[PDB]
Each structure stands twice: as structure tokens, then as C-alpha cells.
Amino acid sequence: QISVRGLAGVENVTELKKNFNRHLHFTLVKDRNVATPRDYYFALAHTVRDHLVGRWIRTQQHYYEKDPKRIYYLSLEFYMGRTLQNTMVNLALENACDEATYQLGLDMEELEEIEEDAGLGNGGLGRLAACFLDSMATLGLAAYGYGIRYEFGIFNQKICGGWQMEEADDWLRYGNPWEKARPEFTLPVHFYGRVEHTSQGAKWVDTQVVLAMPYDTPVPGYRNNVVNTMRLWSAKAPNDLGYIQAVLDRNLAENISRVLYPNDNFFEGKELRLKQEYFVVAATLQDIIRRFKSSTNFDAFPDKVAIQLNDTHPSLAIPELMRVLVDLERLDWDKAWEVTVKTCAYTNHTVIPEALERWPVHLLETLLPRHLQIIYEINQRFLNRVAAAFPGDVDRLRRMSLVEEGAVKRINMAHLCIAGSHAVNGVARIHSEILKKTIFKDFYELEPHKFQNKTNGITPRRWLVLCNPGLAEIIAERIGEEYISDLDQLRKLLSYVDDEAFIRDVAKVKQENKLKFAAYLEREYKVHINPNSLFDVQVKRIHEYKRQLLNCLHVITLYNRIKKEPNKFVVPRTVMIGGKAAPGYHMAKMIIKLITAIGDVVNHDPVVGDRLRVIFLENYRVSLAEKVIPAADLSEQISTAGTEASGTGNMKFMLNGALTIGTMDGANVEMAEEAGEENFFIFGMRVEDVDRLDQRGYNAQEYYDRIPELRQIIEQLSSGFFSPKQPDLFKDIVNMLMHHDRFKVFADYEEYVKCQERVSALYKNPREWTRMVIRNIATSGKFSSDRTIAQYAREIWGVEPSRQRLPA
Amino acid sequence: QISVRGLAGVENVTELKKNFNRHLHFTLVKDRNVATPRDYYFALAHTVRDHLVGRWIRTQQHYYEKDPKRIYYLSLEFYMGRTLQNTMVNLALENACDEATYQLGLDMEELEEIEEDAGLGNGGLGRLAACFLDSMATLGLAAYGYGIRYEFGIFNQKICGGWQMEEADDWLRYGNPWEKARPEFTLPVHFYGRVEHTSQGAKWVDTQVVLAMPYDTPVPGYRNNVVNTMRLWSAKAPNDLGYIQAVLDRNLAENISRVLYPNDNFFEGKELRLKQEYFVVAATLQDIIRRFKSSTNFDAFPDKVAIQLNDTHPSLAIPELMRVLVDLERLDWDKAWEVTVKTCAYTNHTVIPEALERWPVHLLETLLPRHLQIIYEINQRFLNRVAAAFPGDVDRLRRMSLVEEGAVKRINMAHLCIAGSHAVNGVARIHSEILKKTIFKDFYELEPHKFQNKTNGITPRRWLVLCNPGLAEIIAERIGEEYISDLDQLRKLLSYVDDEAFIRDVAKVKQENKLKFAAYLEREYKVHINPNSLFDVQVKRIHEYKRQLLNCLHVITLYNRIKKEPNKFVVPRTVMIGGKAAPGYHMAKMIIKLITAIGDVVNHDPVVGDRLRVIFLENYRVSLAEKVIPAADLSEQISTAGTEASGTGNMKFMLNGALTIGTMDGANVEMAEEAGEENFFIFGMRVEDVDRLDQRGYNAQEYYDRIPELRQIIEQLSSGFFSPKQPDLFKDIVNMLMHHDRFKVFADYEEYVKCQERVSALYKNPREWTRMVIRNIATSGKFSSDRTIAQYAREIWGVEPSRQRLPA
Ligand SMILES: OC[C@H]1O[C@H](O[C@H]2[C@H](O)[C@@H](O)[C@@H](O[C@H]3[C@H](O)[C@@H](O)[C@@H](O[C@H]4[C@H](O)[C@@H](O)[C@@H](O[C@H]5[C@H](O)[C@@H](O)[C@@H](O)O[C@@H]5CO)O[C@@H]4CO)O[C@@H]3CO)O[C@@H]2CO)[C@H](O)[C@@H](O)[C@@H]1O
Ligand SMILES: OC[C@H]1O[C@H](O[C@H]2[C@H](O)[C@@H](O)[C@@H](O[C@H]3[C@H](O)[C@@H](O)[C@@H](O[C@H]4[C@H](O)[C@@H](O)[C@@H](O[C@H]5[C@H](O)[C@@H](O)[C@@H](O)O[C@@H]5CO)O[C@@H]4CO)O[C@@H]3CO)O[C@@H]2CO)[C@H](O)[C@@H](O)[C@@H]1O
């Protein structure tokens, strides 16, 4: 139907229908009289999967022939979402399948909604891994994604009485047609035991063994016939144990890959989590060595292998590589260390202290005896280096140590990663600068060459073509289809900023997206929004640093002003906030309840009418993001300056036609820099302002006494205006805002409200609002993960990206 | 190659090769350069499975159209074994696939050995369920096998230092291509809770819920295009639960279908086992009712439904049916009871007291509150009936009660089954008689019409055509192929008893089978047997009543006689004993060690040479039975008269050309009756003799004092002749034989040894031994499970069997 969805040839459609019926019959063992939409979704999925296998097999064969340098991306999270439509898009099969299903009397869009999201991630960090795999395949890199196949991903969020309830995400219930179990490649992982020191070196013995079974999922590049692999490990117990209990206790070993820890930017030192981290690391490294030996001196190891650590979660890769090289291969320490540093690279994702991994020594000592010895040895040699470079600087030695002293000794995994990696990067310019100015300043001074920046990005395939066909289409009509795999070309759209036709089309697509979402909202949630109002949306994990609370304050302010002057005109808005809170993050759960509570007052106030609506989007996940983002007008990125390392949701909104209101934080800075500050709604303290406020001391009371509108809001919360039956329900919120606000919500309130008035003024002028929108879209090319990946490839991994098509 | 394996048409072979390559590519995602035998086995399996689906779908459709009476076989065990070859046989695809694989350069027999046995059974009872499903499909009955999909079947037995070691049977590791998960038909099962009595009747509330997910496996009839279904339930936890632990505790609910209790003819009142029994029953009945309502008065229920209980394991079906009819459908008690009795039938499998299920009331009270109330109510009305028929007979009331009084009240599940069933049958004439003369005498006097006999049988497909192609072939050359689905025809072979050619062929096939097994024994076990010796084999679960110990005594006697007169001629023998012992059956584990210990002395004694060898066949299972049975000369069926209800292994040996030495027990009686006593080696006490011995009192000492050869053997065991480093290792064995032998091993020793001398005398005359063999094979037709099933169908279920071919 639309150009970018590919061609629908008669032979292709005919063959697709044939294979669809074959799978429904032979694979699902069903007939058209008993089949359900679910059965139809699976028949189509297996049909599309088939077109993938041929390419998957020759791609891997190609890598065996050419034997290029291999990139290994280690992450405990891969927030994939659905893969049916994405596969059709990358294979140019969308229109053919749409026609083929149409002729079979089926609605393809209805079938796509049946697929379960592969929610093996928490948010930012995990989605980045997903976008990265896509870009790596699209750039012809011999890359492999390695992780854990959690049988339960991020929990499904339900709202009961305004509160969040967690439900197990049993995403494998009906099966996963995309993965291929490879039980023949199972590997053993060791735990516990003890260390014996012989004349032949150290030996790790009397260990408990857990098997790692791999499941491979194909990762298709964009129309280049390249299909890479994402290998996920599953835990299995050895078969060799009264008898019944021994068999039942197998679950203890298999619990390792049972569930994803639902923590976003927060560390929890639990033993099960440490086992998961070592489990993925140990199995992946054996696989890497095995594949390498099929290519015995490891001097060439770094020339054939690149290991990228997504945060510190897979940090044990460093001492595990040393263990294998030293203990098993028998290389001398110094040589093994050279190899390790040259193959490992580390990416930091946050600077907040509570997110930093610091494992108690007594834990590593019991679970991984040998690794702790190796870490201590790495530390000694590292401090000897620090001592020799900064003679007499004793405090520097204690600050840089990988071992933190105190009541309980801990291992700072971030320090371990810096020491054992040849490259350390932040995820946005301002974040990377902050890393060498503060948190890792001592390390930067010792080895300035290791620090780099690699600004995050998102894939234009899933985040434009797949979720916003209408926009991709009207862009293609004017500049072609080349931008899809080279986003910088969108810059050519700057020529149509005055084109009356384009302006009308951009505005038309947005309205259609809003209508479609307003409908979806009513269908699956029986809510009630006005498609003409401004869609003000803030979707991301619930966090105090992300400041959904600042957003709440604005909402209440709008409401109080309306009640103040009921018959005054105000731009209509539909404020949508969505996101999950970690199960044990009390404050985050309280913020969700506040949001729904505000909605209960505002949405049922007759005087407000349909001028203001506050909706809480439940179970925010990748598939939901693909729906709400294209329909948004205003993107809320209001974290306190210096806290959001980069952000990626911000980029998604920019690419889909929404204007951005936000602080100079993370990538917001580079976005505004790319679009021009006049085309962004920047407000609030800059990083320097937050620093001055801390030096002096943050006194929330001051803002409370000087801003009557703010005072009124706080008093309403305290008196129980938003919780009649529970007058003090929100006392924790008020107390935190007034006395223990680490994120200075009040400090940015005034400027935020003023800035919000200016976006309202611009929305009243449809033509000008849309022209500013065109200006944002036209300059968002830099935030394509293809650019990001090409920089990692050239500046860290030492490989050259390719657009060369692979033989079909 | 051989006639009975079907035709190998050019088009069929061509199509098979094509589909084989398609599955290797698209399904296994492999290429001929990386594929392993395992991959090849799977490619072939999926290819054969395909030919099954078309028939599977129309068969079920056919039943929907015709709506015939449905047979539901409830069993907690289905000892299936491998299904690849059996499927080819029933579909006449064996030769085509053999050729197709040959042309692809593969050995089909090698690929078949890769398939894992579906060992979801313990022995007799479970294999009977498997043979039954096969016969029911072959006789065109609308039958469904219902059970539990254990993820761990009967343990794999390994021998270490002569001792049995149990290893988890992870049969699903590489996947099961035969099953089809049907998560869309998941059903809820309730546990615990309490009972509320309202004005609207009883209500079972506050229950814990466990989901039952079904997996369907196709069951093809023999060349009739009928494919029935075996539905196995798997336990799954509901999704609605700190957070992590709640997700991990899901394993508690899913443990229900984790493993098969490895007990053969022995009861263990564990809670997990009771949950398994209710789990299979509750899910199956909802499925039965649901399917019935798609055919509201239940007066016609018994006309459309037959429920067969394989032993008392699924006995809760009776009170569960009452619960649903009374509590949910609201039928009056009396009406519901009439329906229940008319749809349920019970099959008893043993008379040994330790095997009888007697569940403690406090257990049923906690786990199934409502069912216990229903059982009490069933009991009261039943005893009122007994009281009215036998006025004043108070002791009769206590004996017939379903509730056993004492320190701990228990529910006799066998009494529950008799009361709620319209038919109760034994599994062999002598067993069924024993049921009404002793154990169920009171019940037989109250309702003589309920008692019947249904002598067990085995399927001639798996137990002749599949495991002994050579014999089936030479039989077919002379009388055609019709006998395969009508075993009585083998009786026509009696005409060739004097045919010199036939005699030579029968003897040739046996020798080839022995050579092939002697080879297999050396390949996978590096053992060392002489193909010319007599193959004396006893394979079955290890039990004191089966008397492997009596066999051991003969072995030692042969050995002692050889040492006595070294240069005397004796017919060479290879004594093979195999079978698993339940993990907690100490005595059974001791018997295995004795057997291997005897082998250590006998097999390494230079004077004996290759005149006597004692081998312990480890990990005896269905696939192993298919190999050793065809190669046997002598079948050992020596249980103490009155203990082996029927036996089925005995039948397998008779059909495959082995002569039988055994007691007048179980089906041995009917076999000897069919072949003629002169063609059987019967010895020992009859049931009447065991009774007289008990009245008088069994004194093992008497036999010890009167039989010097027996005394010598006992003294060797005591002094440590078979355990030098552990002189008293077998003190438990000796003590049991001498003072607490419930099975009177010594009482049959003398006659057993004498009878064994006569089989040796006959083996010295090849021609006559073979003629007696032909006489056994020719009269084994009665023991076909097709005959058994036709009798159940006509005398219990009320349906007529069919040989009508179904449209291809
Ligand atoms: O096998 C070679 C090696 O073995 C032996 O050394 C090992 C140690 O026995 C073992 O304990 C481990 O040493 C760790 C140490 O346990 C751990 O606490 C850490 O120590 C650091 C501090 O973390 C760091 O702060 C700094 O300490 C300062 C302190 O901060 C300051 O306030 C004040 O207290 O002075 C302290 C020292 O001046 O430095 C120490 C270490 O200098 O890290 C240690 C090393 O990682 O591992 C050792 C080697 O593996 C033998 O004893 C040794 O001879 C052999 O060379
Ligand atoms: O709702 C209708 C019904 O409810 C109530 O009756 C119920 C009982 O309250 C309840 O306990 C249960 O009764 C069971 C009984 O608990 C259980 O022990 C069993 O009793 C049998 C013995 O098993 C049997 O041996 C025999 O007992 C002899 C005994 O052997 C002999 O040695 C000597 O002791 O005398 C005894 C009696 O003469 O018979 C008893 C019963 O006669 O089975 C009972 C019934 O299954 O369930 C009852 C009904 O569900 C009300 O009390 C009653 O009025 C209502 O009709």
C-alpha cells in the first residue's frame, strides 16, 4: 500500500499464502475451522522465520570463510520487544505478507498484536542493547549478542486502586518461534569450591556445576541479507543426585535464569544476581575461546576478538578471562593481562551512587574463590602503578583501589572495569565529561587515553519505519528511501520547512497517529481522551531523578488555575505519564498512586471539562512505546541536570515529530545543539547551577515561602485534597519534597511552569508549531544508532563498518 | 528389503528425501556440513510426523461427525518407549524411509538408536497402557489416553561397583517432536481450601489453583489411517504473587508433574503423589465434560462416555465426578451416582498388600476437603446396602467399609473403586478367580455381576514386526500378512511343525538375533558372550515375589557342579538378568549386587571357561526389551504361585521364539494351556500348595537340612565366598531366606533345578527344541492386546471394534 513497505509481487504473495497454509496444517496441526487469531499469528511467524534461515546459515558461513574480527556484546539485558514486524521490515516483506494475509481473509495488524514482547530488559540500558544488535547487523559487522534467557522478563504492571501490582511475565507460555535451542552446544559453569595451589599453578576444585544451554535468535540487518546471532543462555542441572527430593532440587540450579531483576539504575547485592552475572560470563567466554581456536598463541586474540561490557554487570569477564588464560592455558600473568586489556572495553551508564555495583568480599569469597584472588592481584599491580605515578599520594591509592575498606569490604566493579579495559566511554558528551571531571577523575589522570564518548542512538527501523509508517512515507516521497539506513539525509528536509504541502502532511500524519492512539486507549482501556488537545507525554521508568513529580506539580498548577478562572481560555491538554516502578522502591510506587489520584480529581471535575486530562499509561513497555511515541506532541525530559547519563526516549520523540521540553541533561544538550536552541524548550538549572546550590545547601522551604502557587499545591497534598478517605496518604511525598529532596524539584518549578506556558502559546499556532517540528525531525539524524555503532567500530573495536549487500 | 516393511515407491522415496532436506534446513537450521546423527534423526522424525498430521486431523474430525461413544483410559503411567519406528510400521513407511535415507547416505537403524525412550512408566502396568492405546487405534475405537507429562520419567540405572545408581531421566533435553503443546486448552485444578454449606448446597472455597496444560501425542492404528490421541497434562502456576521469591516459588506448583514415582507394585503415601493423582483426574474430567456438552441432562452421559481406571491410581475420578455432577451441575445424589457407576470401570493389577493404596484421612482432609465428605457419604450408603443384604453381619460391615479404622484412619481406594464401578476385572483368569475367592470375596457376594476377567495381552506390532523383522518375514512368507492385525492366524503355523524348511528358518532367525545382540552387548558394554550357548534370560523389575533370587540359586548350583566335575559336559549357558529396583527398596538393591557378585566369581573362573556366564543387563527399559527378547532361548517366569497377577513379559518371549520355564502363576497358566503343557516347562507349587504350606507354617530350615546342594550355597554366601573383602555383605539375604521369606524360595528350589536339567536336555536336540518353539509361537495368538481390547470393548464399554479403513 505505501512505498516503504516493499513490493507485493504475485509470485511472492502466492508462495507466502502456500507456506502459511502449510504451517497452519503441519506445524500448528490445525484447520481453518478451529484456528484462532493466535494460531494465525503463529502460522505467519513461522512463514516469515523461514525466509530468515537461508540468510542466517550463509551469513555464519561467510564469517567462517572470511574469519573477520568478532564483536561480542555482553549484556544481562536485551529489551527486544516484538520481532514479527521488525523482521518483515528488514526483509522487505511487509507489503507482500499484508497482501497474502489479506487474500486469506486476515488482518495482519490484528495478528501482530498477538505476539508477546520479549521484555528481557528494564529500560534504557536494555533497549540500547536491542538497537545496537540491529545496527551492527545493518552495518555488516560479525557481531554476537550474548545474554541470559530469562524465562520471566520484566513484570507486567497492573493498576489496582491506583496502585501498581506486579504480575509474572510468562512470555514463553505459547512458545517462541524465533529462537532455536542448541542443546548440543551446552557448556558447564562452576560455582563455590576452593583453590588448591600446586607446583603447576592454582586449581579451582570441588565446585558445584551448572550447565549453560544456548538458545539462538536471528538478528536481520536492514535489507542487506545479513543475519547475525543473539545467543541467550539457559541454566540446566547435570543429571548425576531421597531420590524424589534430589530430582526436585534441580530447580535450585535452574533458578539462575528464572527471572530478570526488575531494578532500573539501582544496585541490590543479592547472591542470585551475582550467579547470573558469572553464569552469562563463564559460558560466553568458553564459547568465544572455542570459536577462536577454530580460527596456540593468544597474541592474536585481541585482533580477532572484541568484548564490550554493557555496564559493570558482565565485569567478571575480566578476571574470568585472566583465570582461563593463566590457570588453563598457562600464559604468564603479564602476557595474559595485555591480552585482556586489549580485548575488553567498558561502557558506563550512570553516575548515581546507588546504581554502582559494590560486591561484598565475603560473597565473592564463597561463590568465586579464585576470581577474588585474581581481583586482589589485579588490584595490587594496579596500585603499584598508581604509587609509581603519584609518589606519596596515599589518599589517591585508597580512592582508586578496586577494594573499598570499611565495616564490610567490597569490590568496586567500575574500578575493576576501568583497570582491565583499553577503552571506557560515557553515553553522551556531558556525561562523558562528568566522568573525567568527577567520579573517575583519578583514573582519567592516570590513563587519559582510555576515556571516550559514544553518544547513544536509536534504530530508525523500529523507531520510525515500523512504528510510524505514515511519517516515513511522506519523508520518502520527497527525499527517497536512502535515509532509513543513513539518517543524516533527513537534513535535506530542511528545504521543505516552508513547503505548504509538506507542513500539511506532517501535521496530518500526527493527527492520524493521535486518532489511532485515542482509539486504542478507548478499546483496551475504556479511557476517554480528546484528539484535539495537546498530547503531553512522559514515559520512562519511575524514578525520583527523572522527576515525574515535577510534572505532577505542573499538572496540579494547571488545574488550580482553571478553577481560579474557569471561563478563561487555556490550550487543552492530555497529560500522559507511564512507566514501571521497581517492586521494592517505595517512593516510586507512591508517585504512581499520586498520579492516578490526581487523575481521579481532575478527570471528574465538571468545571475542567475536556480541557485537562491526566492519564496513567499502564504496563509501559516497548510495544506500547511504538504506539504512544508517534502520537505525542510534547516530550517530557525533565531529569535534574547531571543525573540522566543520556536518555534514549528523548531521541525517539524527536524522530517522530514531537517537540521537547527539558533540562540541559544527557543527550538533550546535543539534541538542542543539533536542532538549534530556538527549536527546543529548555528550562531549569544547568549542571553548574546544581553544583552551586549544593555548595550553599538546598533549602526547599525557601521556595515554599516565596511561591504561593507552590505553597497551595503542597497544602492540598497535606490536607488530603487528593486523598479524602486517607488525608495523610501522601505525607511521605511532602516530607521528602520539603526535607530530603536529592533532586531539587522545587528549584526548577518556576522556570518549568513558565516554559510550559510558552509551549502552549506555540501550540495555538498550528503552522509554526509544525514548522518547528520539521526542524527537529530534519536534524535528528545524528541520533541513529548506526552512527553510534560506526564510532564504536572505528574508535574502540578496530573494525570497518560495511553497507555491502550479502548474496541473497 | 523384506516384504512386511512395506513398499518403497520411486515417488514416495523422492518426496521423503525432499522433505528430509527441507526439515534439516528450515526446521533444524543446519546444513550437511555441520549436521550430526542427532540432527539427522530429528530431520527424519519430523518427516515421518508430517505423514501423521493429515490423518490425525481427519480422525478427530470423523469422531466429531459420527459422535461415537468415547473411551477414556486414565493411567498415571504410559510406558511408550520410542515412537519413530513404530510410526513407520503403522504407516507402512519403513522401507520407503530406509531407502530414502540410504540414498541420502545414512543408516536408518543408526538414527533410530538416537531417539530417547519415553519412559513414563515403571513396568507391567505402564507398558499395558501403551499396548492398549495401540490396539484401540488399530480397532477403530474413539479412545483417548489421559495421563501426566512427567518431565523426568523412570530413572536411568547405572551400575557402580556392582551397585545400582539412579540418574535423572532428562528425556526432554533435546526436545520431543512427537508431542504438540496445546496451551490454549489449559484447565484449572483446585487444592486445599475448605467447604462451605449454603442453602444452595456445598461450595469448595479458598482453594490453591494449579493450571493443567495439555500436550497431545498421536497414536496411529495399524495401517487403517486412524490416529487417536494421548493427552498428557503438565503443571503450571497462575501468573497472579519479595517479588523475586514469589516468582521462584512457582516451582512448588509445577513440581506436581516433575517426576514419576519409581515404585513398582508398592504403595508410598506421599502428598506429592496424591496431588499427581488428583491433578490428572480433575483436568481429565473437565475435558471429558466439556467434550460431552459439545455433543443439559447427563442421563445420556454413560452412553457417550466410558472411563477406565488403570488400577486405583486414578480412583479419585469417582468422587470427583460426583462432586461436579452434584456441586456444579446440581443433579440429585442418586441420579449422579447412577451416572457415575455406569461410566466407570476398574482394573485391578495385584493382590500383594503392600501395593494397595490406603490414604490417611488427615491427608485427604487437608488436600481435598470436599472429596473426603463425598467418600464418607458414598461409604454410608454403601454400608446401608451391605447391612440390608446381610442383616446382623457386623464384621462384614467393618471389612467392606471404604474407611479402615485404627491408629490412623485410611481410605481403601480399591473398595472405593469396586463400589463406584459397574465392572471390576482382574488381568488373568487365575488372578480374577483369586479376587473373588479371597481379597474381594465380600464384594463378589454382594454384587457378583461386577466381576470379570480380561487377560492381558501385548501388541504384535511393536513386539513382533518392529523388534523381530526376521521372524515376522518368514511367518509372512507362509501365511501372509493378515496375522499382524489378527494374531489367531499364527495357529496356521502348526502345519509347518514338521516342515524341514521352516524349522531351519525359525532356527536361523533366532541365531541371527543372538549374534546381533551378542554384538550389541560387546559394542555398548564391552561384555563377552558366546552366541552358541543357551540364552537364559529373566528381565523385569527387581522384586522378591518375582524371585530373581531363586534364579541366582540355580546359577550358583550350576557353577558348583562344574567345579565338582570340571571335565563333564554341560550345555553352555549365558544367564542374563536385568531390571531396575525402586530406590528405597533395600532388599531389591541387595539382589542386584548379589547378581553382579556372582558374575565376578563365575565369569573369571578358568575352569568354567565359556560354559557359564552371568550377565546383569543394566538400564532395562522398553528399547532394551525390543533387543534382548528376540534373542532369548529361555524365558524365566518364576514368581511364587499366586503373586504375579498376569505378567506380560512372558507373552513377549512366547511370541518371539523362546521356550518358557515357570510356575503356574498369572498368565503362564493360560499360555501353557494354549500351547499344551508338554510344550512348557512348568515346575513348583501351585496356588493350592502355597496355601497348605502357610496353614502348616513355612520352615526354610527344613529345606536347608535336607538338601546338601542348597546348604552349600547358603554357606558360601555366609562365609563370604562371593564377597571376599566383605565376608558378611550378604547377611541380610541369608537371614531373609532362612527366617523371613514371604515367597518361599527354598520350597521351589529342588523342582526348579530338576526342571532346568530338562530344558538343557532338550537344547541338546536343536531340531526338537525348535519344533517345540514353533508350537509356542503358533499358539500365542490369544495374547494379542487386540483380543484383550475387543473384550473390554464388548463386555465393559459397550462399543463394537472395527477394522474398517479410514479415508486416506
Ligand atoms: O600473591 C601475591 C601477593 O600475595 C599476598 O598479598 C595479598 C594480600 O594478602 C591480600 O590480602 C590481598 O590484598 C588486598 C587487601 O586485602 C585489600 O584490603 C586491598 O588493600 C588496599 C586497600 O584497599 C587500599 O585502600 C590501600 O590501603 C591503605 C588504606 O586505604 C590507607 O587508609 C591506610 O590504611 O594504608 C593502607 C595501605 O597503606 O592499599 C591496600 C593495599 O596496599 O587490596 C589488596 C591488594 O589488592 O591481595 C594481595 C595480593 O593479591 C602477599 O602478602 C604479597 O606479599 C604478595 O605479593
Ligand atoms: O451428611 C449425612 C450424614 O452426616 C453425618 O454422618 C457422617 C459422619 O459424621 C462422618 O464421621 C462420616 O462417617 C464415617 C465414619 O467417620 C467412618 O469411621 C466410617 O465408619 C464406619 C466404619 O469404618 C465401619 O468399620 C463400621 O464401624 C463399626 C466398627 O467397624 C465396629 O467394629 C464397631 O466399632 O461398630 C462400628 C459401627 O457399628 O461402620 C462405620 C459407620 O457405620 O464411615 C462412616 C461413613 O462413611 O460420614 C458420615 C456420612 O457421610 C451424620 O451423623 C449422619 O446422621 C448423616 O446421615
Ligand SMILES: *Cc1c(COP(=O)(O)O)cnc(C)c1O
Ligand atoms: C527507549 C525506552 C526506554 C528509555 O527511555 P528514557 O526516557 O531514556 O528512560 C525505556 N523503556 C522503554 C520501553 C523504551 O522503549
Ligand SMILES: *Cc1c(COP(=O)(O)O)cnc(C)c1O
Ligand atoms: C513388558 C515389560 C515389563 C513387564 O514384564 P513382566 O515380566 O510382566 O514384569 C516390564 N518392563 C518392560 C520395559 C517391559 O517391556
